[PDB]
Amino acid sequence: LPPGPFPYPIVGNMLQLGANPHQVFAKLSKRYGPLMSIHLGSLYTVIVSSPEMAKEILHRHGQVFSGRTIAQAVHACDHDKISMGFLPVASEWRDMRKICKEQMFSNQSMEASQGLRRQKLQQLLDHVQKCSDSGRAVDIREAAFITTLNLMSATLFSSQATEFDSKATMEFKEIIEGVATIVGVPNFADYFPILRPFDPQGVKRRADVFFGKLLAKIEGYLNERLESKRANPNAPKKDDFLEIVVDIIQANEFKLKTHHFTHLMLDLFVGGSDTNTTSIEWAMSELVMNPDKMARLKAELKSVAGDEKIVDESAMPKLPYLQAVIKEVMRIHPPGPLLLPRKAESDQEVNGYLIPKGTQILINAYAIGRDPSIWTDPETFDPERFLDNKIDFKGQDYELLPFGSGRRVCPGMPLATRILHMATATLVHNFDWKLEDDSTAAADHAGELFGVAVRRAVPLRIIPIV
């Protein structure tokens, strides 16, 4: 087996992990190497911590390592048996991946929904403008969360509510927060198989409630669209993912049931929520903490957008510094620092070590992004490192893996980058910014809180200036 820290009876290595396990794993891998054994109680895990080993696991042996380790929480509403995020690579997963790549996240689809998203960007601008008038700080975590939910709702469901903090959006927010609280803490049933039939912390039961609420909402939207289409056969077609779902269901060419589609919408909605919210906040934190970089981005946006307040998504090729800024945020702050777990589908030798069937595989993208043998001055926020650099986060550069790579690489990437780029551009282009309170600025920026997505422990509060 790969080398690793001595595991104690019962607990294995769990007592050493602390509040930020990705940081502890990063330190440990400097000692034990880029394939490292970790015993999470009885859940045997191998941590992968170099571009070389990431390529061996995700690419060379990409089929063997194409499964997922499935948390007990994911059994909520039988999601484990239905979800593209957790099913093994087989016909159902392949069909859903095809629908995502060719239909939902196609260039045509993303382009068709730019208008839907533009409304939500305008609402963010309005919210910040009100704060600017009163000289009050913007809670960037809250504003990013609401904006992300709005942009996701707009794209998935054509939600066109005129209030920034609409009823539907705030209901989604409560559900997403609920999921995060449930899963952000260790479920002992994941680590001790004898506890699985007991659900001793009520994690699965509580997840049932929140997944159930999300599924009921999505089912309601689907039913409403089905009826509205039946009743209005001459109305123009909507430009959202729900329209695609209806058309696929009615064409009946896939061996998939209605529940595959509703659980798929659930995965897309949840998938894009905490990840984008935390990333927008980190982007703003980095830019405010590094004023020369804020100035360079503002200058780019001024030259391209001029007096226009809301940048067109189609202008992205004209904005290389904005692209570089977001690559650099992804390098330093991958929202899932250990990605999503993979699993060995069979015994496989890698670099002379046996990885047994069933092993949980965690790619420490955070460690790779901060490794000084890979990235010069890795703790420095330096978007210029990406200018005229072909390195990207699409999965082909094993130094930069915030969306993963190989078989299960993030399918929402085309929508995620539009959300990250446009929310960041909207905030930066339209206002100057200062910290509400800078007395502990450096500590506030450095301190992370582990969870579904890693976040700044102290929410970023910044005052917009005209």
Asked if 337 interacts with ligand HEM (CB under 6 A), we say no
Which entry of Mn ion, ligand HEM, none binds 462, CB below 5 to 8 A by partner kind? none
- The kind and range of the H/E element at 51 are helix 51-55
**Residue 389: closest CA among 407, 372, 375, 403:** 375
Which residue lies nearer to ligand HEM by CB, 332 or 420? Answer: 420
Asked if 204 interacts with Mn ion (CB under 5 A), we say no
Helices 241-251/140-157 angle, 10° precision: 30
Asked if 260 interacts with ligand HEM (CB under 6 A), we say no
- Decide if 450 contacts 19 (C-beta within 8 A): yes
Asked if 79 interacts with Mn ion (CB under 5 A), we say no
**Residue 268: closest CA among 298, 240, 246, 288:** 240
Which entry of ligand HEM, Mn ion, none binds 148, CB below 5 to 8 A by partner kind? none
Which span sits near ligand HEM by CB under 6 A: 175-183, 252-260, 264-272, 310-318? 264-272
Can you tell me the distance from the alpha carbon of 418 to that of 437, in angstroms, rounded to the nearest whole number? 31
- Decide if 62 contacts 406 (C-beta within 8 A): yes
Closest separation in Å from C-beta 405 to ligand HEM: 6
C-beta nearest to Mn ion: residue: 75
Asked if 415 interacts with ligand HEM (CB under 6 A), we say yes
- Decide if 71 contacts 37 (C-beta within 8 A): no
Residues 6+ apart with CB under 8 A from 201: 187, 188, 189
Can you tell me the distance from the alpha carbon of 307 to that of 238, in angstroms, rounded to the nearest whole number? 31
Burial degree of 142 (CB within 10 A; 0-12, 13-18, 19+):
middle
Can you tell me the distance from the alpha carbon of 5 to that of 207, in angstroms, rounded to the nearest whole number? 33
- DSSP annotation of 346 reads S
Which span sits near Mn ion by CB under 5 A: 12-20, 70-78, 154-162, 358-366? 70-78
- Site size with Mn ion, rule: CB under 5 A: 1
- Binders of ligand HEM in range 168-227 (CB under 6 A): none
User: What is the amino acid identity at position 275?
Assistant: T
Which entry of ligand HEM, Mn ion, none binds 12, CB below 5 to 8 A by partner kind? none
Which span sits near ligand HEM by CB under 6 A: 166-174, 186-194, 312-320, 335-343? 335-343
Cross-strand bridge partners of residue 35: 48
Which entry of ligand HEM, Mn ion, none binds 75, CB below 5 to 8 A by partner kind? Mn ion
What does the per-residue mask of binding to ligand HEM show for 81-100, with x meaning CB under 6 A? Answer: ---xx---------------
Which entry of Mn ion, ligand HEM, none binds 402, CB below 5 to 8 A by partner kind? ligand HEM
| Position among 138, 410, 427, 462 found at the interface with ligand HEM (CB under 6 A) | 410
Asked if 425 interacts with ligand HEM (CB under 6 A), we say no
Closest separation in Å from C-beta 76 to Mn ion: 9
Can you tell me the distance from the alpha carbon of 57 to that of 55, in angstroms, rounded to the nearest whole number? 5
Residues 6+ apart with CB under 8 A from 224: none
**Greatest extent of the chain over all pairs of C-alpha atoms, in Å:** 68
Closest separation in Å from C-beta 134 to ligand HEM: 31
Closest separation in Å from C-beta 78 to Mn ion: 6
- Site size with ligand HEM, rule: CB under 6 A: 26
Can you tell me the distance from the alpha carbon of 2 to that of 353, in angstroms, rounded to the nearest whole number? 6
Which residue lies nearer to ligand HEM by CB, 29 or 273? Answer: 273
Which entry of ligand HEM, Mn ion, none binds 409, CB below 5 to 8 A by partner kind? ligand HEM
Asked if 71 interacts with ligand HEM (CB under 6 A), we say no
The answer on whether 131 is annotated among ligand-binding residues is no
Which span sits near Mn ion by CB under 5 A: 47-55, 72-80, 89-97, 117-125? 72-80
User: What is the amino acid identity at position 276?
Assistant: N
Can you tell me the distance from the alpha carbon of 141 to that of 329, in angstroms, rounded to the nearest whole number? 15
- Decide if 425 contacts 311 (C-beta within 8 A): yes
Can you tell me the distance from the alpha carbon of 367 to that of 355, in angstroms, rounded to the nearest whole number? 21
Which residue lies nearer to Mn ion by CB, 80 or 171? Answer: 80
Asked if 13 interacts with ligand HEM (CB under 6 A), we say no
Asked if 368 interacts with ligand HEM (CB under 6 A), we say no
Report CA dihedral (30, 36, 37, 38) to the nearest 10 degrees.
50
Which span sits near ligand HEM by CB under 6 A: 189-197, 229-237, 268-276, 430-438? 268-276
Q: 3-state class of 449 per DSSP?
A: strand
Which residue lies nearer to Mn ion by CB, 75 or 418? Answer: 75
- Decide if 222 contacts 240 (C-beta within 8 A): no
**Residue 427: closest CA among 386, 465, 455:** 465
Asked if 75 interacts with Mn ion (CB under 5 A), we say yes
Which span sits near ligand HEM by CB under 6 A: 218-226, 274-282, 346-354, 432-440? 274-282
Can you tell me the distance from the alpha carbon of 239 to that of 174, in angstroms, rounded to the nearest whole number? 26
Which residues form the interface with Mn ion (CB under 5 A)? 75
Which residues form the interface with ligand HEM (CB under 6 A)? 84-85, 267-268, 271-272, 275-276, 279, 335-336, 339-340, 402-406, 408-412, 415-416, 420
Q: Residue ranges for the binding site for heme?
A: 410
